[PDB]
Amino acid sequence: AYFQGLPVEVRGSNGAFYKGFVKDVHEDSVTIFFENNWQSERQIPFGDVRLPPPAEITEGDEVEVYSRAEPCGWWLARVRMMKGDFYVIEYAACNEIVTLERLRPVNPNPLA
């Protein structure tokens, strides 16, 4: 009851984090719906779950980028260069030019 609809982020097999919402909480996992799929419940172990970030990007900063390699997920990256509103980033999983809507500081929340 208490955790109904809690937003969480879930580690995919690709290392990226995907948004889901809690339905039930068990001793060792949660039942969730992934974002844009309210029909299929999915069970995720706590070691694959973190809370989403609490509610300034400069060159060199570690960031996360919202990308597909699939649904979009948050991927770990670094800002190699910025000029105006263009950001040049490199993925920790592997350059891409993105705008600021695609970026956030690294979620400070650890896996549960």
Numbering used by the authors: 10 to 64, 69 to 82, 86 to 110, 115 to 132
Could you pull the original sentences from the published paper?
The crystal structures of the N-terminal tandem Tudor domains of FXR1 and FXR2 were determined at 2.50 Å and 1.92 Å, respectively, and revealed a conserved architecture as compared with the same region of FMRP. Superposition of the FXR1 and FXR2 tandem Tudor domains structures yields excellent alignment with a 1.0 Å r.m.s.d. The N-terminal Tudor domain (Tud1) spans residues 2 to 49 of FXR1 and residues 13 to 56 of the FXR2 protein. The Tudor domains tilt toward one another to generate an interdomain angle of approximately 110°. Interaction between Tud1 and Tud2 creates an interface of 257.5 Å2 for FXR1 and 258.9 Å2 for FXR2. The orientation is stabilized in FXR1 by an ionic lock formed by inter-domain salt bridges between E6 and R47 from Tud1 and E65 and R112 from Tud 2. The corresponding residues for FXR2 are E17 and R58 from Tud1 and E76 and R123 from Tud2. Furthermore, FXR2 shows some degree of preference for H4K20me3 peptide. NMR titration experiments carried out for FXR2 resulted in similar shifting with only 1.5-fold molar excess of H4K20me3 peptide suggesting a specific interaction of higher affinity than for the methylated lysine alone.
